[PDB]
Amino acid sequence: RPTFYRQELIWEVPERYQNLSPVSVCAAFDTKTGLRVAVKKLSRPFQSIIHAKRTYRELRLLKHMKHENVIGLLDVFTPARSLEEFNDVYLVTHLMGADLNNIVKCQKLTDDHVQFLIYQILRGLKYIHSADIIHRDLKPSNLAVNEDCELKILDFMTGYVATRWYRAPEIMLNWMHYNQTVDIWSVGCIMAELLTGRTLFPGTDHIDQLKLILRLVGTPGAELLKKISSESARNYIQSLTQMPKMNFANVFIGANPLAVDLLEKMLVLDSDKRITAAQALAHAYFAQYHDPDDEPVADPYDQSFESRDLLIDEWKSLTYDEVISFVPPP
């Protein structure tokens, strides 16, 4: 057990972590690794069963993720000396220093920067999806980028808000039980924005955003309507005047036509027929970056705990076990 010191920004961290300042997330200098780090404090982690399960979920996810393009755990600690006093979880990872919004604002991007940036999302996404994990909330603010344009994926709704602009229609409107290609829709929205500098579907609300979406990709055909299990949702869509799919070369004028092709494969209304991350990486657009030998998959991820109903203290004991058994990367 290392020595801890206290400071109010209350944060109680091992002395290896120095020069803490706010970003509940702090930036710090890790003196063991020489890396700048983001330290997240989970403050009321075992408050309800919902909360206690969420802490356990977060820790498990972060402990599993060992990929260059996914946020992993450099360290996890608690100032607590026993399960009895255990009540704080601190999570340490690499500091990148900016998200993807803080990147288009600062510089104009080449088709090359877009390639490298989207390649990295799909590479980490191939990895996340291989462990049968769905991000569900991919957005430029959940993408951590450093100065070398290297990228890591992090985390895992009313009106004119960015929180909803990148969501697949089937999830935004609870159409069906959704797969991992909801994340591919999100990448499509992100990619488009990188090429145009403008949000793809900046709807003022859920319906407006659906209209924007259907204007580009067309109204659903007979087959996808069948797959919409929400009878309420299916019934509304059919009230809309049929629209065909727009020409994407006319929407994304002057774009690398390979980039246009990949956007068409990504932004398919029927989630069953979207391109997967594994497939998208093999797309001609990433010929420059693609290396099937350097695009690894994840180890088995056991999420059978998700189906389990447990009392607060049980989720907390599980979380604790996971804290104390943590072995740092090397």
Ligand SMILES: O=c1ncn2nc(Sc3ccc(F)cc3F)ccc2c1-c1c(Cl)cccc1Cl
């Ligand atoms: O560069 C970053 N790298 C990591 N994170 N992590 C987190 S949260 C987190 C997750 C897992 C940890 F182990 C620890 C945590 F703190 C939040 C931001 C962040 C950034 C970052 C910064 Cl420092 C400024 C502006 C935008 C971003 Cl996306």
Ligand SMILES: [Cl-]
């Ligand atoms: Cl805009």
